[PDB]
């Protein structure tokens, strides 16, 4: 789905965190809705970061500097895939908000099934391969970027032009790569905060516990892949 539409759905969600409707629910509900918000908002930022990497930097290198498709895969491996995964994950979350209206005021009573789906079966396998690759090529790409900046004056001009743009916050390529690398390790924390906020709901508590166990398996797999890559690079 479209990024502006995604941002409007996010901005809409956040209006309800500030609302009097929410602030006048029970403390445990306010806290639970506040943590589920955090998961959504940070997933939106992740998707935004990825699409800036792709639409601004990656597309710009090919269009302006005549980089090949392969030189860009060196800097940003599996970027198209990541964008697909996280936009879709982000959609599922919004789709859940849309069916959680009350009596425009909503209250997410159930998000565990969405998380379990995302981190099991072939979705989990896609994340493992995707991040294992991105997180493995991680340090080579940052060095490759820094190598290019110091050497190629045309890339140097390109980067300064981009950082000045209103589109990129002041997101440098190194920062982008670093943010994307971290992301997968954020989920256990966000998921576990939702779980400990969830009271008197058995289905949800079970699914959240499951998703938390599941995302740790993915992280493990990614860490094995990264370790092996680095050993091979030497």
Residue numbers in the entry: 1968 to 2070, 2074 to 2204
Give the published text.
AKAP-Lbc (also known as AKAP13) is a member of the A-kinase-anchoring proteins. AKAP-Lbc exists as at least three splice variants, however, all contain a conserved RhoGEF (Rho GTPase guanine-nucleotide-exchange factor) domain. RhoGEF domains decrease the affinity of a Rho GTPase for GDP so that GTP, present in higher concentrations in the cell, can bind.
To investigate whether for our constructs the AKAP-Lbc PH domain contributes to catalysis of nucleotide exchange on RhoA we cloned an expression construct containing just the DH domain (residues 1976–2211, terminating at the end of αI) for comparison with the combined DH–PH domain. This we refer to as the inactive conformation, in which the position occupied by Trp1980 in the active conformation is now occupied by Ile1984 and Ile1983. In this inactive conformation, the critical Glu2001 can no longer bind to RhoA. We cannot rule out that the inactive α-helical conformation is induced by the N-terminal protein tag which is at the start of this α-helix. However, we note that the region around Trp1980 is weakly predicted to be α-helical by the PsiPred server, suggesting that a conformational exchange in and out of an α-helix induced by the absence or presence of RhoA is a realistic model.
